[PDB]
Symmetry: C2
Subunit: 253 residues, 2 copies
Protein backbone atom coordinates (compact mmCIF):
# COMPACT_ATOMS: atom_id res chain seq x y z
CA UNK A 1 0.00 0.00 0.00
CA UNK A 2 2.48 2.63 1.20
CA UNK A 3 5.17 1.33 -1.15
CA UNK A 4 2.94 1.80 -4.18
CA UNK A 5 1.91 5.32 -3.20
CA UNK A 6 5.64 6.12 -2.91
CA UNK A 7 6.45 4.47 -6.24
CA UNK A 8 3.86 6.76 -7.87
CA UNK A 9 5.44 9.70 -6.06
CA UNK A 10 8.74 8.70 -7.63
CA UNK A 11 7.25 8.85 -11.15
CA UNK A 12 5.62 12.25 -10.72
CA UNK A 13 9.09 13.79 -10.20
CA UNK A 14 10.06 13.21 -13.84
CA UNK A 15 7.06 15.09 -15.23
CA UNK A 16 8.72 18.44 -16.03
CA UNK A 17 11.82 16.89 -17.55
CA UNK A 18 9.48 14.65 -19.51
CA UNK A 19 7.32 17.55 -20.78
CA UNK A 20 10.46 19.46 -21.72
CA UNK A 21 11.71 16.39 -23.64
CA UNK A 22 8.40 15.71 -25.38
CA UNK A 23 7.38 19.31 -26.20
CA UNK A 24 10.25 21.81 -26.19
CA UNK A 25 11.95 23.14 -29.29
CA UNK A 26 14.95 23.34 -26.97
CA UNK A 27 15.22 19.55 -26.67
CA UNK A 28 14.92 19.01 -30.43
CA UNK A 29 17.61 21.67 -30.99
CA UNK A 30 19.99 19.89 -28.58
CA UNK A 31 19.40 16.70 -30.56
CA UNK A 32 20.35 18.43 -33.83
CA UNK A 33 23.26 20.18 -32.14
CA UNK A 34 24.51 16.71 -31.17
CA UNK A 35 24.11 15.28 -34.68
CA UNK A 36 25.53 18.35 -36.41
CA UNK A 37 28.60 17.95 -34.19
CA UNK A 38 28.72 14.23 -34.87
CA UNK A 39 28.66 14.77 -38.63
CA UNK A 40 31.50 17.27 -38.40
CA UNK A 41 33.55 14.98 -36.15
CA UNK A 42 32.94 12.04 -38.51
CA UNK A 43 33.89 13.94 -41.67
CA UNK A 44 37.17 15.01 -40.10
CA UNK A 45 38.08 11.67 -38.51
CA UNK A 46 40.49 9.24 -40.16
CA UNK A 47 40.45 5.52 -39.38
CA UNK A 48 43.79 4.05 -38.30
CA UNK A 49 45.75 2.70 -41.28
CA UNK A 50 44.43 -0.74 -42.20
CA UNK A 51 41.29 -0.15 -40.14
CA UNK A 52 37.68 0.35 -41.13
CA UNK A 53 36.00 3.57 -39.96
CA UNK A 54 33.32 2.88 -37.34
CA UNK A 55 30.82 4.92 -35.33
CA UNK A 56 29.20 3.44 -32.22
CA UNK A 57 25.88 4.69 -30.86
CA UNK A 58 23.39 3.74 -28.14
CA UNK A 59 19.75 3.34 -29.18
CA UNK A 60 17.31 4.23 -26.41
CA UNK A 61 17.11 8.04 -26.01
CA UNK A 62 19.99 8.46 -28.46
CA UNK A 63 18.77 7.31 -31.86
CA UNK A 64 15.33 6.09 -30.66
CA UNK A 65 12.64 7.80 -28.58
CA UNK A 66 11.01 5.77 -25.77
CA UNK A 67 9.60 8.80 -23.94
CA UNK A 68 6.13 7.21 -24.25
CA UNK A 69 7.23 4.57 -21.71
CA UNK A 70 8.16 7.36 -19.28
CA UNK A 71 4.71 8.85 -19.92
CA UNK A 72 3.16 5.48 -19.10
CA UNK A 73 5.15 5.48 -15.84
CA UNK A 74 3.88 8.91 -14.77
CA UNK A 75 0.27 8.06 -15.59
CA UNK A 76 0.25 4.59 -14.05
CA UNK A 77 2.53 5.43 -11.13
CA UNK A 78 4.59 2.31 -11.84
CA UNK A 79 8.37 2.21 -11.86
CA UNK A 80 10.50 0.47 -14.48
CA UNK A 81 10.54 -3.33 -14.54
CA UNK A 82 12.08 -5.76 -17.08
CA UNK A 83 8.65 -7.31 -17.71
CA UNK A 84 6.81 -4.12 -18.67
CA UNK A 85 9.82 -2.81 -20.60
CA UNK A 86 9.80 -5.92 -22.79
CA UNK A 87 6.09 -5.37 -23.35
CA UNK A 88 6.82 -1.80 -24.49
CA UNK A 89 9.57 -3.03 -26.81
CA UNK A 90 7.06 -5.45 -28.33
CA UNK A 91 4.37 -2.79 -28.77
CA UNK A 92 6.73 -1.55 -31.48
CA UNK A 93 6.01 2.17 -30.99
CA UNK A 94 9.50 3.73 -30.67
CA UNK A 95 10.00 7.08 -32.42
CA UNK A 96 13.09 8.59 -34.05
CA UNK A 97 15.14 11.19 -32.18
CA UNK A 98 15.43 14.32 -34.30
CA UNK A 99 18.46 14.21 -36.62
CA UNK A 100 19.26 10.59 -35.82
CA UNK A 101 18.13 8.80 -38.98
CA UNK A 102 19.89 11.34 -41.24
CA UNK A 103 23.19 11.13 -39.35
CA UNK A 104 23.19 7.34 -39.10
CA UNK A 105 22.28 6.92 -42.78
CA UNK A 106 24.88 9.56 -43.69
CA UNK A 107 27.63 7.59 -41.99
CA UNK A 108 26.77 4.28 -43.68
CA UNK A 109 26.58 6.06 -47.04
CA UNK A 110 29.81 8.00 -46.64
CA UNK A 111 32.75 5.76 -45.83
CA UNK A 112 31.81 4.47 -42.38
CA UNK A 113 29.81 1.76 -40.62
CA UNK A 114 27.32 2.35 -37.80
CA UNK A 115 27.24 -0.01 -34.82
CA UNK A 116 24.24 -0.04 -32.47
CA UNK A 117 25.35 -1.20 -29.01
CA UNK A 118 22.30 -1.13 -26.77
CA UNK A 119 20.99 -2.45 -23.49
CA UNK A 120 17.76 -3.80 -24.93
CA UNK A 121 17.94 -7.58 -24.41
CA UNK A 122 19.40 -9.77 -27.15
CA UNK A 123 17.09 -12.53 -25.92
CA UNK A 124 13.56 -11.02 -25.94
CA UNK A 125 13.88 -7.47 -27.26
CA UNK A 126 15.66 -7.97 -30.57
CA UNK A 127 12.56 -8.68 -32.67
CA UNK A 128 10.75 -5.49 -31.64
CA UNK A 129 13.94 -3.42 -31.96
CA UNK A 130 14.56 -4.70 -35.50
CA UNK A 131 10.98 -3.88 -36.60
CA UNK A 132 11.02 -0.30 -35.26
CA UNK A 133 14.42 0.47 -36.78
CA UNK A 134 13.26 -0.90 -40.15
CA UNK A 135 10.12 1.22 -39.87
CA UNK A 136 12.10 4.37 -38.99
CA UNK A 137 14.44 3.88 -41.93
CA UNK A 138 17.77 3.05 -40.31
CA UNK A 139 20.06 1.35 -42.84
CA UNK A 140 22.62 -1.32 -42.00
CA UNK A 141 20.89 -2.98 -39.04
CA UNK A 142 21.92 -6.66 -39.05
CA UNK A 143 23.50 -9.47 -37.01
CA UNK A 144 26.89 -7.78 -37.31
CA UNK A 145 26.03 -4.20 -36.44
CA UNK A 146 23.31 -4.64 -33.79
CA UNK A 147 24.93 -5.59 -30.48
CA UNK A 148 22.25 -6.05 -27.83
CA UNK A 149 22.68 -6.98 -24.17
CA UNK A 150 23.62 -10.49 -23.10
CA UNK A 151 24.99 -10.80 -19.56
CA UNK A 152 26.62 -7.38 -19.03
CA UNK A 153 25.23 -3.82 -18.99
CA UNK A 154 28.67 -2.25 -19.39
CA UNK A 155 29.64 -1.83 -23.02
CA UNK A 156 33.41 -2.39 -23.16
CA UNK A 157 33.09 -6.07 -24.15
CA UNK A 158 30.84 -5.21 -27.10
CA UNK A 159 32.99 -2.24 -28.07
CA UNK A 160 36.05 -4.51 -28.17
CA UNK A 161 34.03 -6.96 -30.24
CA UNK A 162 33.58 -4.23 -32.84
CA UNK A 163 37.29 -3.37 -32.85
CA UNK A 164 38.22 -7.07 -33.11
CA UNK A 165 36.15 -7.19 -36.31
CA UNK A 166 38.76 -4.86 -37.79
CA UNK A 167 37.19 -1.49 -37.05
CA UNK A 168 38.52 1.78 -35.61
CA UNK A 169 35.82 3.41 -33.46
CA UNK A 170 36.28 7.09 -34.37
CA UNK A 171 33.20 8.39 -32.59
CA UNK A 172 30.78 7.48 -29.79
CA UNK A 173 27.22 8.77 -29.38
CA UNK A 174 24.96 8.49 -26.34
CA UNK A 175 22.83 9.78 -23.49
CA UNK A 176 24.77 7.92 -20.73
CA UNK A 177 28.48 8.47 -19.94
CA UNK A 178 28.85 4.64 -19.94
CA UNK A 179 28.12 4.90 -23.70
CA UNK A 180 31.68 6.26 -24.00
CA UNK A 181 33.43 3.35 -22.26
CA UNK A 182 33.62 1.63 -18.85
CA UNK A 183 35.44 4.51 -17.12
CA UNK A 184 32.17 5.76 -15.60
CA UNK A 185 30.59 2.33 -15.04
CA UNK A 186 28.98 1.89 -11.61
CA UNK A 187 30.57 5.18 -10.40
CA UNK A 188 28.92 7.90 -8.28
CA UNK A 189 27.70 11.14 -9.89
CA UNK A 190 30.55 13.08 -8.30
CA UNK A 191 33.05 10.66 -9.87
CA UNK A 192 31.25 10.83 -13.23
CA UNK A 193 31.51 14.64 -13.05
CA UNK A 194 35.26 14.16 -12.44
CA UNK A 195 35.51 12.08 -15.58
CA UNK A 196 33.72 14.85 -17.49
CA UNK A 197 36.01 17.61 -16.16
CA UNK A 198 39.17 15.63 -16.97
CA UNK A 199 37.85 14.90 -20.49
CA UNK A 200 36.05 18.23 -21.12
CA UNK A 201 37.60 18.74 -24.56
CA UNK A 202 36.38 15.38 -25.82
CA UNK A 203 32.66 16.20 -25.87
CA UNK A 204 31.22 17.16 -29.24
CA UNK A 205 34.43 15.76 -30.75
CA UNK A 206 34.89 12.05 -29.88
CA UNK A 207 32.06 11.74 -27.36
CA UNK A 208 28.66 13.05 -28.57
CA UNK A 209 26.03 13.61 -25.88
CA UNK A 210 22.20 13.52 -26.01
CA UNK A 211 20.03 14.73 -23.07
CA UNK A 212 18.09 12.20 -20.99
CA UNK A 213 16.32 13.66 -17.96
CA UNK A 214 14.03 10.68 -17.34
CA UNK A 215 16.43 7.95 -16.33
CA UNK A 216 19.95 6.62 -16.49
CA UNK A 217 23.01 5.76 -14.48
CA UNK A 218 23.01 9.21 -12.98
CA UNK A 219 20.08 7.74 -11.05
CA UNK A 220 22.17 4.84 -9.70
CA UNK A 221 25.01 7.32 -9.24
CA UNK A 222 23.05 9.00 -6.47
CA UNK A 223 23.88 6.30 -3.93
CA UNK A 224 25.92 3.08 -3.89
CA UNK A 225 22.85 1.24 -2.57
CA UNK A 226 20.13 3.32 -4.26
CA UNK A 227 18.35 0.36 -5.86
CA UNK A 228 18.52 -1.85 -2.77
CA UNK A 229 16.13 0.52 -0.99
CA UNK A 230 12.34 0.73 -1.18
CA UNK A 231 10.51 3.67 -2.76
CA UNK A 232 10.68 5.78 0.44
CA UNK A 233 14.43 5.16 0.57
CA UNK A 234 14.69 6.44 -3.01
CA UNK A 235 12.57 9.53 -2.26
CA UNK A 236 14.89 10.38 0.65
CA UNK A 237 18.01 9.91 -1.48
CA UNK A 238 16.55 12.14 -4.18
CA UNK A 239 15.59 14.91 -1.76
CA UNK A 240 19.08 14.76 -0.26
CA UNK A 241 20.55 15.21 -3.73
CA UNK A 242 19.10 18.68 -4.29
CA UNK A 243 20.97 21.84 -3.37
CA UNK A 244 18.82 24.80 -2.43
CA UNK A 245 19.18 28.52 -1.81
CA UNK A 246 18.28 29.31 1.82
CA UNK A 247 15.66 31.85 0.75
CA UNK A 248 16.93 34.85 2.72
CA UNK A 249 13.98 35.00 5.13
CA UNK A 250 11.41 40.61 11.42
CA UNK A 251 8.01 41.81 10.17
CA UNK A 252 5.09 42.70 12.44
CA UNK A 253 1.99 44.89 12.48
CA UNK B 1 -9.94 25.65 1.86
CA UNK B 2 -8.61 27.42 -1.24
CA UNK B 3 -5.34 28.51 0.40
CA UNK B 4 -4.40 24.96 1.42
CA UNK B 5 -5.55 23.62 -1.94
CA UNK B 6 -3.35 26.03 -3.88
CA UNK B 7 -0.40 25.34 -1.59
CA UNK B 8 -0.69 21.58 -2.08
CA UNK B 9 -0.94 22.12 -5.85
CA UNK B 10 2.01 24.55 -6.01
CA UNK B 11 3.98 21.94 -4.07
CA UNK B 12 2.86 19.32 -6.59
CA UNK B 13 4.08 21.58 -9.43
CA UNK B 14 7.50 21.76 -7.77
CA UNK B 15 7.80 18.03 -7.12
CA UNK B 16 7.44 17.48 -10.90
CA UNK B 17 10.74 19.27 -11.58
CA UNK B 18 12.71 17.24 -9.01
CA UNK B 19 14.29 14.65 -11.34
CA UNK B 20 15.30 17.22 -13.95
CA UNK B 21 16.80 19.47 -11.28
CA UNK B 22 18.65 16.50 -9.78
CA UNK B 23 19.92 15.58 -13.25
CA UNK B 24 21.02 19.19 -13.77
CA UNK B 25 22.79 19.51 -10.42
CA UNK B 26 24.31 16.03 -10.15
CA UNK B 27 24.75 14.28 -13.53
CA UNK B 28 28.04 14.09 -15.33
CA UNK B 29 25.74 14.09 -18.37
CA UNK B 30 24.59 17.65 -17.86
CA UNK B 31 28.14 18.87 -17.38
CA UNK B 32 29.20 17.08 -20.59
CA UNK B 33 26.36 18.79 -22.49
CA UNK B 34 27.62 22.21 -21.31
CA UNK B 35 31.15 21.41 -22.49
CA UNK B 36 29.77 20.04 -25.75
CA UNK B 37 28.04 23.37 -26.29
CA UNK B 38 31.09 25.49 -25.42
CA UNK B 39 33.48 23.33 -27.46
CA UNK B 40 31.07 23.75 -30.39
CA UNK B 41 30.99 27.49 -29.79
CA UNK B 42 34.78 27.88 -29.70
CA UNK B 43 35.02 26.05 -33.02
CA UNK B 44 32.29 28.18 -34.58
CA UNK B 45 33.95 31.37 -33.33
CA UNK B 46 37.40 30.43 -34.57
CA UNK B 47 35.94 29.86 -38.04
CA UNK B 48 33.62 32.90 -38.24
CA UNK B 49 34.72 35.91 -40.27
CA UNK B 50 34.09 43.81 -35.50
CA UNK B 51 33.26 40.30 -34.33
CA UNK B 52 30.74 39.81 -31.52
CA UNK B 53 29.30 36.85 -29.64
CA UNK B 54 25.96 37.24 -27.88
CA UNK B 55 25.02 35.06 -24.93
CA UNK B 56 22.27 34.79 -22.34
CA UNK B 57 23.34 34.55 -18.69
CA UNK B 58 20.94 32.55 -16.52
CA UNK B 59 21.23 28.82 -17.18
CA UNK B 60 23.65 29.61 -20.02
CA UNK B 61 26.82 31.14 -18.51
CA UNK B 62 25.68 31.14 -14.86
CA UNK B 63 23.94 28.54 -12.74
CA UNK B 64 20.83 29.50 -10.72
CA UNK B 65 19.75 25.93 -9.98
CA UNK B 66 19.91 26.65 -6.24
CA UNK B 67 16.85 28.88 -6.74
CA UNK B 68 14.95 25.95 -8.31
CA UNK B 69 16.09 23.83 -5.36
CA UNK B 70 14.65 26.46 -3.01
CA UNK B 71 11.35 26.25 -4.92
CA UNK B 72 11.12 22.45 -4.56
CA UNK B 73 11.98 22.50 -0.85
CA UNK B 74 9.67 25.35 0.06
CA UNK B 75 6.98 24.38 -2.43
CA UNK B 76 6.87 27.98 -3.65
CA UNK B 77 6.60 29.00 -7.30
CA UNK B 78 8.61 31.69 -9.05
CA UNK B 79 8.00 35.35 -8.25
CA UNK B 80 9.87 38.55 -9.24
CA UNK B 81 10.22 39.57 -5.57
CA UNK B 82 12.01 36.41 -4.43
CA UNK B 83 14.03 36.17 -7.65
CA UNK B 84 15.47 39.63 -6.94
CA UNK B 85 16.30 38.44 -3.40
CA UNK B 86 18.18 35.50 -4.97
CA UNK B 87 20.04 37.80 -7.37
CA UNK B 88 21.01 40.04 -4.46
CA UNK B 89 22.18 37.01 -2.45
CA UNK B 90 25.08 36.90 -4.88
CA UNK B 91 25.43 33.10 -4.93
CA UNK B 92 25.25 32.29 -8.64
CA UNK B 93 27.68 29.63 -9.85
CA UNK B 94 29.52 29.20 -13.18
CA UNK B 95 28.14 26.74 -15.75
CA UNK B 96 30.88 24.35 -16.80
CA UNK B 97 33.02 25.68 -19.66
CA UNK B 98 31.33 29.07 -19.65
CA UNK B 99 34.10 31.14 -18.08
CA UNK B 100 36.83 29.67 -20.31
CA UNK B 101 34.82 30.21 -23.51
CA UNK B 102 33.82 33.81 -22.69
CA UNK B 103 37.33 34.85 -21.68
CA UNK B 104 38.67 33.04 -24.73
CA UNK B 105 36.48 35.08 -27.05
CA UNK B 106 37.42 38.36 -25.41
CA UNK B 107 41.16 37.63 -25.56
CA UNK B 108 41.11 36.28 -29.12
CA UNK B 109 39.63 38.86 -31.47
CA UNK B 110 35.97 38.94 -30.44
CA UNK B 111 33.77 40.88 -28.01
CA UNK B 112 31.30 39.20 -25.64
CA UNK B 113 27.85 40.70 -25.11
CA UNK B 114 25.68 39.57 -22.23
CA UNK B 115 22.02 40.10 -23.08
CA UNK B 116 19.99 38.90 -20.17
CA UNK B 117 16.51 39.18 -18.73
CA UNK B 118 17.73 39.96 -15.26
CA UNK B 119 16.31 43.42 -14.57
CA UNK B 120 18.50 46.42 -15.40
CA UNK B 121 16.91 48.38 -12.58
CA UNK B 122 17.23 46.11 -9.53
CA UNK B 123 19.33 43.10 -10.53
CA UNK B 124 22.35 44.70 -12.17
CA UNK B 125 24.44 45.12 -9.01
CA UNK B 126 24.11 41.49 -7.94
CA UNK B 127 24.83 40.42 -11.49
CA UNK B 128 27.96 42.54 -11.73
CA UNK B 129 29.34 41.22 -8.42
CA UNK B 130 28.74 37.52 -9.21
CA UNK B 131 30.33 37.85 -12.66
CA UNK B 132 33.43 39.57 -11.23
CA UNK B 133 33.72 36.81 -8.62
CA UNK B 134 33.42 34.02 -11.21
CA UNK B 135 36.11 35.53 -13.39
CA UNK B 136 34.12 36.77 -16.39
CA UNK B 137 36.23 39.46 -18.11
CA UNK B 138 34.77 42.36 -20.10
CA UNK B 139 31.53 42.99 -18.20
CA UNK B 140 30.69 46.70 -18.35
CA UNK B 141 28.14 49.40 -19.17
CA UNK B 142 28.63 48.64 -22.85
CA UNK B 143 28.60 44.83 -22.83
CA UNK B 144 25.93 44.08 -20.23
CA UNK B 145 22.50 44.54 -21.78
CA UNK B 146 19.99 43.81 -19.03
CA UNK B 147 16.21 43.91 -19.32
CA UNK B 148 14.35 47.21 -19.51
CA UNK B 149 10.76 47.26 -20.80
CA UNK B 150 10.90 44.19 -23.07
CA UNK B 151 11.57 40.45 -22.63
CA UNK B 152 12.39 39.84 -26.30
CA UNK B 153 16.00 40.49 -27.24
CA UNK B 154 15.81 41.77 -30.84
CA UNK B 155 16.11 45.40 -29.67
CA UNK B 156 19.22 44.80 -27.55
CA UNK B 157 20.58 42.64 -30.35
CA UNK B 158 20.19 45.55 -32.78
CA UNK B 159 21.87 47.89 -30.28
CA UNK B 160 24.86 45.59 -30.48
CA UNK B 161 24.89 45.79 -34.27
CA UNK B 162 24.54 49.60 -34.31
CA UNK B 163 27.73 49.85 -32.24
CA UNK B 164 29.43 48.49 -35.32
CA UNK B 165 29.41 44.77 -34.53
CA UNK B 166 28.67 41.65 -36.56
CA UNK B 167 27.08 39.07 -34.25
CA UNK B 168 28.70 35.84 -35.44
CA UNK B 169 27.36 33.53 -32.76
CA UNK B 170 24.45 33.27 -30.30
CA UNK B 171 24.45 31.14 -27.11
CA UNK B 172 21.45 30.28 -24.94
CA UNK B 173 19.09 27.91 -23.19
CA UNK B 174 15.90 29.52 -24.65
CA UNK B 175 15.10 29.69 -28.38
CA UNK B 176 14.28 33.39 -27.94
CA UNK B 177 18.03 33.79 -27.28
CA UNK B 178 18.48 33.36 -31.04
CA UNK B 179 16.06 36.13 -32.12
CA UNK B 180 12.36 37.02 -31.94
CA UNK B 181 11.19 34.23 -34.31
CA UNK B 182 10.11 32.02 -31.39
CA UNK B 183 8.91 34.84 -29.09
CA UNK B 184 5.54 34.14 -27.43
CA UNK B 185 4.96 31.11 -29.72
CA UNK B 186 3.58 27.65 -28.86
CA UNK B 187 5.91 24.68 -28.39
CA UNK B 188 4.68 23.19 -31.68
CA UNK B 189 5.62 26.41 -33.51
CA UNK B 190 8.97 26.57 -31.71
CA UNK B 191 9.62 22.95 -32.75
CA UNK B 192 8.93 23.90 -36.36
CA UNK B 193 11.42 26.73 -36.13
CA UNK B 194 13.96 24.17 -34.91
CA UNK B 195 13.24 21.77 -37.80
CA UNK B 196 13.41 24.56 -40.38
CA UNK B 197 16.76 25.71 -38.92
CA UNK B 198 18.13 22.30 -37.86
CA UNK B 199 21.53 22.76 -39.47
CA UNK B 200 22.09 26.01 -37.54
CA UNK B 201 22.42 24.43 -34.09
CA UNK B 202 26.00 24.09 -32.92
CA UNK B 203 27.07 26.46 -35.69
CA UNK B 204 25.42 29.88 -35.28
CA UNK B 205 22.98 28.92 -32.50
CA UNK B 206 24.54 27.23 -29.43
CA UNK B 207 22.10 25.49 -27.07
CA UNK B 208 22.34 24.80 -23.32
CA UNK B 209 19.89 22.49 -21.51
CA UNK B 210 17.38 23.98 -19.10
CA UNK B 211 14.71 21.54 -17.89
CA UNK B 212 13.78 23.72 -14.92
CA UNK B 213 12.01 26.67 -16.56
CA UNK B 214 11.61 28.66 -19.79
CA UNK B 215 9.33 29.79 -22.58
CA UNK B 216 8.70 26.14 -23.29
CA UNK B 217 6.53 26.42 -20.18
CA UNK B 218 4.44 29.27 -21.55
CA UNK B 219 4.42 27.50 -24.91
CA UNK B 220 2.30 24.73 -23.41
CA UNK B 221 -0.92 26.78 -23.60
CA UNK B 222 -1.93 30.35 -24.52
CA UNK B 223 -3.44 30.78 -21.04
CA UNK B 224 -0.93 28.76 -19.03
CA UNK B 225 -0.16 31.56 -16.59
CA UNK B 226 -3.72 32.88 -16.48
CA UNK B 227 -4.95 29.83 -14.55
CA UNK B 228 -4.37 28.66 -10.99
CA UNK B 229 -2.01 25.82 -10.00
CA UNK B 230 -4.69 23.19 -10.57
CA UNK B 231 -5.08 24.36 -14.17
CA UNK B 232 -1.32 24.24 -14.68
CA UNK B 233 -1.33 20.66 -13.41
CA UNK B 234 -4.03 19.82 -15.96
CA UNK B 235 -2.19 21.48 -18.85
CA UNK B 236 1.00 19.72 -17.81
CA UNK B 237 -0.78 16.36 -17.60
CA UNK B 238 -2.30 16.89 -21.04
CA UNK B 239 1.13 17.72 -22.48
CA UNK B 240 2.53 14.24 -21.79
CA UNK B 241 2.19 11.48 -24.37
CA UNK B 242 1.97 7.98 -22.89
CA UNK B 243 2.12 4.36 -23.99
CA UNK B 244 -1.22 2.72 -23.10
CA UNK B 245 0.56 -0.09 -21.27
CA UNK B 246 -1.08 -2.73 -23.47
Amino acid sequence: AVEQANQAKLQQQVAMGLIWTQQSGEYAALAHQAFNSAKMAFDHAKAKKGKKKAVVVDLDETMIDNSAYAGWQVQSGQGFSPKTWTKWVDARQSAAIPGAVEFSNYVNANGGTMFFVSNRRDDVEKAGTVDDMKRLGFTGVNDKTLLLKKDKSNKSVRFKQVEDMGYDIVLFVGDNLNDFGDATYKKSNAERRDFVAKNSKAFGKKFIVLPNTQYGDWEGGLDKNYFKGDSQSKLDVRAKAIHAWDGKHHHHH
